[PDB]
Amino acid sequence: EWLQAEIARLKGKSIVPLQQVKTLHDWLDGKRKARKSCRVVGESRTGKTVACDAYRYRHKPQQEAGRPPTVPVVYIRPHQKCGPKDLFKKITEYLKYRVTKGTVSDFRDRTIEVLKGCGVEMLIIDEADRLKPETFADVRDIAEDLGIAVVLVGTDRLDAVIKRDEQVLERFRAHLRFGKLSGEDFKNTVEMWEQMVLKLPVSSNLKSKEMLRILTSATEGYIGRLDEILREAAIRSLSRGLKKIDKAVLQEVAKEY
Amino acid sequence: EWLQAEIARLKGKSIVPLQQVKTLHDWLDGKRKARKSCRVVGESRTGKTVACDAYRYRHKPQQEAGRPPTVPVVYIRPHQKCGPKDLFKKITEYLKYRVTKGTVSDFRDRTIEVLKGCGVEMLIIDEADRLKPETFADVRDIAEDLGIAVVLVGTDRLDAVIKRDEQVLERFRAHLRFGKLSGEDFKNTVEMWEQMVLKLPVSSNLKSKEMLRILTSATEGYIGRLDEILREAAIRSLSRGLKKIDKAVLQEVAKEY
Amino acid sequence: EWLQAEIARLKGKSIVPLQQVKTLHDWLDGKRKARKSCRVVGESRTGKTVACDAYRYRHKPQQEAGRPPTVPVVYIRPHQKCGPKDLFKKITEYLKYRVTKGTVSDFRDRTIEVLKGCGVEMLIIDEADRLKPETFADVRDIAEDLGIAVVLVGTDRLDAVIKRDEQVLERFRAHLRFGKLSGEDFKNTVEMWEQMVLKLPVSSNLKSKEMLRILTSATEGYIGRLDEILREAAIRSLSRGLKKIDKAVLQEVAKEY
Amino acid sequence: EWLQAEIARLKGKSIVPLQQVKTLHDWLDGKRKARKSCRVVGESRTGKTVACDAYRYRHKPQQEAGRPPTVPVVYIRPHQKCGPKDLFKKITEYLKYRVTKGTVSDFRDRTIEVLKGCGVEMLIIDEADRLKPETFADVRDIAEDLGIAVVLVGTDRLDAVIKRDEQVLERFRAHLRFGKLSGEDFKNTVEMWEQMVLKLPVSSNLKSKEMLRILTSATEGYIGRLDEILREAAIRSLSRGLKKIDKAVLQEVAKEY
DNA sequence: TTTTTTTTTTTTTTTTTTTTT
DNA sequence: AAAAAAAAAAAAAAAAAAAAA
């Protein structure tokens, strides 16, 4: 069924190139070469996690020799109230090693051992705020002992957590401020969105002012909302037998927010 | 004894089709297809929980194959000050899997494993206000890692809890409002009520204005009160040897509120 | 005495054909042909062990020459904290060989000799959890060295044991999820039960709703409870000089659970 | 019967040339010439044991002289909790000598006599982790006294055992890490597998993306799972009278994992 | 400025058995 | 007939990061 094939596609996710994503990638590349600690802070739904995923794919692990694959970048997202056994477990699994039964001290060395050999140029710890304060000692140890940069990406609240510990605050001072869209950048993003993200049989012309003012009021510059508003409107429109998104559909969806 | 058979019936509960229930079911069906996460908020005794139960029965689990049943929808109601071990336990038991002794970090993974295979297209959490703030991290993780929609049903107080966390508030921005009954919808509901819920030997004619003004003052548009006023009046009337509800009985019951 | 003859019969056990048993039987038949090693997991009192017994009798020993019997399938149930000398002893006795005095290293080899010669295409080890972890090495060796598939039937707790050893977990990934009864399948099972298991002089009509709601509340879908509730009720009823089971008897028995 | 002839074939096993197997053979060849003890560690079902078997067959025993058969490479797999009498017995039997009744101190010396004479350049001990710690002394003695290199092939758990003894850890420091398949290597392996391992009359075109995404999700890069999924699907397909594997069959089998 | 509420994270110990020699 | 080794678990508080009037 054509309709179901398009809905199964639309409900899915993809990465769209944006000025903000390229900016982060070039910035992280500098910190990687210099091995310097830094921070990534911005508002929710601005597309910070997605840009980090894209970076991991930009430079993939290289395995041209018999030895363990050389993984230049490690990306992890700690669970809630993450303790020191959990941080080490997740780093080790990411690099494809199995963790054996033992205590924190027992595989701490193993984490170091697995960290060595593989390149591990940079460690990106998304959602840094969700971590027990005691674990920031093991993060500093890694950053200090090994030639590894620790990006530590987080939301605005993270700064409230970082400032509670002098030694952490004075080691992660450099920061990039991820932001939201406004002005022409938003209009160009909507034009990009229609053509690449949407494969609808008939064009919706979402760049038009009459509907762009609606997308602007509904979105407020958050790339996460633009994705929801247009992705749901496309499925709701096709489900009615339409070949494009009607102004009435954009209004009907916007009213739910 | 005929009288006791009718009292044993009247003291029981049933689901009556209403415009508000159909409206929610069609709305949830859209969010299910789009895998969109959104809240359901309204006043107490408006019949929010009952509409959610009716939805679960609309799409029942399928057992055609010898494989584990594909449950399209999961409905749970967390206990007071629900923590992260309790949320996972209740989801797992709802899928007929028994939980073994272990830590959150052990059956957090089992939950994901039971979540995979079973369809679990949508997760409805009633009494969303009854969650420790720390648990909203495990809810976001589920909503993010897998394509599952989370309803997060709650009362007006839920909004006061949601706005305390930026990341949670942004994710659940879309909402549906239950409301209450007023005008013709109430009169038609009373007519439906006497016909479908009350089966007294002789008709009471509750639609009549002389008694409808009483039901209106006593219920103030809450389907929960209309249920109580008429269900108690029917038992109290039969217990006196009456075949119908007298105006005097409706007045006597209303005076207690 | 007629009464004692019926009680001596009722207190006994028998195998009733069910949809779950046939499903189980023909799934095992696929694994047997493919020589695949797979696990089978189910809740207590769902009739997992009985279905395995029925399978053994479906595929009986065949003797076409003076050579040892061509035993197609082996079924064993290990004792508590079963060690490697005990697993080998029980396999060997099952095939009707006497075990001589010696060490594990002596009749480990004798076990291989008698696993050979006879076909022994399948080995079903019920209650797999009750086994010392060290013995899973001898089970893998059999499964690896000989063209034999091993079932590993067990309860939910078995999965907690299996996941403690990487090499066992990976080998035994395929699974069948034995379940409980609900809906029409339960009503039809009660009709079958009264139809075949119970031969009372006068019919009880256990499929009627007034008593079926009682059997449902008392049974909760477990075939083991339906068997207890009706088997005890039949003996208790006959002992009172009744020719059928009265609603009062089903209620009296249900109250004990 | 054609169908049974194909099933009797499909249920069997064979060795498929792979990049990982050639890599190990060239690596072991270097250690053999240098007489250097070394390790082989990787995950379960990655095809570690099969590559070792292929190596033994690459360099078969040569018997062109008066002296006893010269086996350059010896391959053994110790039983569970293998002690020092068992290690010596299995080495001696492999070289085709009968072991007489006596003590460890008697055929410890007989083992040395038969290790000598025959070239015995390399000893490959599979499943090294399942060995008694006391036996590693007899392994070091062989490696130290005789010009013989010992491989010590095993899983991730072996490293936890090795690090418990300083003298063993230092001796076996060199290692080759086995890796699972990902990317193009997996797609090319599926194409190769269909051509050489499957002799089905009608081509299945398993390289196609629609079914390759299914094989990828079901396999997760483990050559052991790709073998199982496709080998069972071929038997299940032929048993239905099909000349090829249908997408429906690959899905039906994948659902069991 | 107070008063719980709980959570994991910890080892130390004490016995019991199943074979080798 | 006298020894060595490998389990295989139930204890009994306890210092403390975090939280609610």
Ligand SMILES: Nc1ncnc2c1ncn2[C@@H]1O[C@H](COP(=O)(O)OP(=O)(O)OP(O)(O)=S)[C@@H](O)[C@H]1O
């Ligand atoms: N470059 C992009 N291309 C396509 N979609 C994007 C992009 N960036 C963000 N999104 C959308 O944003 C949604 C949420 O992902 P992110 O915005 O990356 O999450 P986030 O930035 O971590 O915000 P949080 O939840 O506060 S941490 C996804 O559903 C994406 O569709």
Ligand SMILES: Nc1ncnc2c1ncn2[C@@H]1O[C@H](COP(=O)(O)OP(=O)(O)OP(O)(O)=S)[C@@H](O)[C@H]1O
């Ligand atoms: N298909 C069946 N036919 C007849 N009796 C059955 C059947 N299934 C279960 N029973 C009854 O259940 C008892 C046997 O236990 P099972 O029902 O097999 O429980 P189980 O599945 O073995 O669960 P456990 O406790 O884990 S062994 C006997 O008393 C049988 O009479």
Ligand SMILES: Nc1ncnc2c1ncn2[C@@H]1O[C@H](COP(=O)(O)OP(=O)(O)OP(O)(O)=S)[C@@H](O)[C@H]1O
């Ligand atoms: N060259 C090959 N040709 C055909 N089948 C192969 C080949 N290599 C591996 N396999 C299959 O994939 C599985 C994995 O190989 P194994 O011999 O199990 O190595 P392994 O998984 O490292 O051993 P374990 O599980 O750690 S004891 C085997 O059971 C084979 O069926």
Ligand SMILES: [Mg+2]
């Ligand atoms: Mg995020």
Ligand SMILES: [Mg+2]
């Ligand atoms: Mg049983």
Ligand SMILES: [Mg+2]
């Ligand atoms: Mg192997």
